[PDB]
Design a protein around this ligand. Structure first.
Ligand SMILES: [Zn+2]
Ligand SMILES: [Zn+2]
Ligand SMILES: [Zn+2]
Ligand SMILES: [Zn+2]
Lengths: 363, 363
């Protein structure tokens, strides 16, 4: 039944600077070296950690305890494992002697060369820092695996002008070998992934406004659909609720598309933020979701599917939780708040988990 | 004799994305909460690690071994300790009960609020990623400690246009409370630090050329001078040797200034890159130093000081070493190559160490 393997490289919303948003995707079970990244925060560094670290598992927290039981953060039915998947690792183990002789750094370069394509949601630095700093790895060899960075224009235009511009970073897109490329996607259009037999469908969403400019700051939701099984996952960039009159109902458009085109049984997971707990703090919430806003969005999706079973069976994987100087880990607070609000709103057998770095989900 | 405490938050040259360049400075022994940062790669995340991790000490490597003895990377006379200094930690311990009640995350916010001023060498993303992602922490409170980002114009203009621009990052400099400010420094001019009784003297250096534009890419060397003791440290941005005819001898200007104005006995350390080992690889070396180029620069400084004792007693702390898919840790290769070349060039009792994240130097 499992179609997707999702490696959580980074699920941190800030303001600490490591492990920011990046998810690796591949088909379940298969052993090709090729990998897709959604966003570009945590990258090589995190792959290396997972190659070393790989039960009463404890995960980092730094609140009530420095480490906490893994099960506290996840739905009890979630198919999750620590480390990289057996099949991802098998692409290194295709050569017996070579795998054993290769040190951790070498293994990291090898796995990382397989990242063919990034789908970037928006160009905020926390979503691109690993993509950028890791990028010179592409020049380690003559016979070279090339990388492509995909996005809607609001992302690609910014990367071209403000990142790969010989000021913030050497303009690797200008190098004649074209080992790093920027490519635009059209919104709402079914586009094809390059290696996997998957469709990718990007949708624009709102993510606040400029501090100086007041201009809308856009983000992206990506649908990945396995063509054979028709199973899908939704992987989201940072997002806030739409404003009734002053703007386009981008989220309504998105949920309507999902309900029309993807039966709930085929929706294997949504990776979506809840940056903040219910406790106000407007400065930290701008451009983001809190549990009431996320539950309101899921309630809208529920209304569109229009089943008496609610969202029963749906896996919601909560990403981009921010640190806060609070007594309790906000991931735990948010998880409890979301579960409470889902129960209050009668959303059915909805399965809510927090995304945990250094783990793979099987959906 | 020790005047400076230098906390190494990040000394990684890339392409792995965590622990990139950032050094914290404070006067030795004193317990004020205020701190200076040079560069802005590793930040809050690394402070938090150091608050938790704090003998046969092993440090991360990931080559021949995943962890290696600390002493392999340093000169035997180097005054170094793991973790934050006792006096830095004392600023938290001024309140007994409060310190004990505060969790690791809270302690991290508290220490980090003390970073008053950043001195940025150049705006490449690896030198600013932590500064940027950490910056919203400034809005955690009403009665707020404010931060200032200092640099030469080649840095500040780029940060204004390409980073704090509501596209790559919210433009926090436009927020009316002015809790984050960008300020320019004049090159070669003795300027004053805001809290510590220190002079700061910035010098422009070369750091390669644009891939697309061919334009010179500049960097900065910072001299910090304690006015009472007259002791100085030099903390460097990324740099390459000058080209004889085609450009200004920026490095010659710098070493000449040092030899004229700072007696060797007062020069307590230089933190300077050696990104690459002697083994060629032009693509990785562009804009950077290898051991022959670094030793040539130190030889030039030696000639200017003009002593038969060479650079005896000088601490050279090597930063920004890049990963490479090699059998041996390049920090070890580089250390051996530098020591060999220094001996061959008769530079005297020069003390060479690699900068190690998660440690404090006392110079
Ligand atoms: Zn974000
Ligand atoms: Zn964002
Ligand atoms: Zn650098
Ligand atoms: Zn640089």
């Amino acid at each position: 039944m499992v179609v997707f393997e999702i490696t959580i490289l980074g699920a941190n919303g800030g303001p600490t600077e490591y492990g920011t948003q990046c998810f690796i995707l591949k088909p379940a079970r298969t052993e090709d070296p090729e990998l897709i990244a959604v966003d570009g925060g945590a990258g090589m560094y995190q792959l290396r950690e997972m190659l070393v670290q790989g039960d009463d598992e404890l995960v980092p927290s730094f609140y009530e305890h420095d480490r906490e039981p893994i099960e506290f953060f996840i739905d009890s039915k979630l198919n999750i494992q620590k480390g990289l998947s057996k099949s991802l690792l098998q692409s290194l183990k295709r050569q017996g002697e070579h795998f054993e002789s290769a040190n951790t750094m070498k293994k990291t370069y090898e796995v990382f060369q397989g990242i063919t394509d990034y789908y970037i949601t928006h160009p905020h630095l926390d979503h691109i820092s690993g993509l950028v700093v890791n990028s010179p790895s592409i020049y380690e060899q003559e016979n070279s695996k090339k990388k492509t960075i995909w996005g809607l224009p609001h992302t690609i235009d910014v990367l071209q002008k403000h990142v790969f511009n010989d000021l913030i970073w050497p303009d690797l897109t200008a190098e004649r070998s074209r080992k790093l490329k920027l490519k635009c996607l059209n919104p709402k259009e079914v586009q094809k992934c390059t290696i996997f037999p998957w469709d990718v469908i990007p949708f624009k969403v709102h993510h606040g406004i400029g501090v100086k400019t007041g201009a809308p700051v856009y983000s992206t939701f990506y649908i990945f659909r396995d063509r054979k099984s028709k199973d899908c996952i939704i992987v989201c960039g940072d997002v806030e609720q739409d404003r009734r009159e002053s703007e386009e109902s981008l989220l309504e458009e998105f949920w309507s598309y999902v309900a029309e085109n993807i039966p709930l049984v085929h929706l294997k997971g949504i990776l979506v933020e809840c940056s903040c707990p219910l406790s106000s703090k407007p400065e930290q919430l701008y451009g983001h979701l809190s549990p009431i806003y996320l539950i309101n969005e899921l309630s809208n999706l529920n209304t569109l599917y229009n089943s008496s079973k609610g969202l029963s069976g749906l896996n919601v994987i909560v990403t981009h939780v921010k640190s806060t100087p609070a007594k309790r880990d906000p991931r735990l607070t948010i998880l409890e708040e979301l579960r409470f609000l889902a129960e209050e709103r009668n959303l059915g057998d909805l399965r809510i988990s927090i995304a945990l770095e250094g783990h793979t989900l099987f959906l």
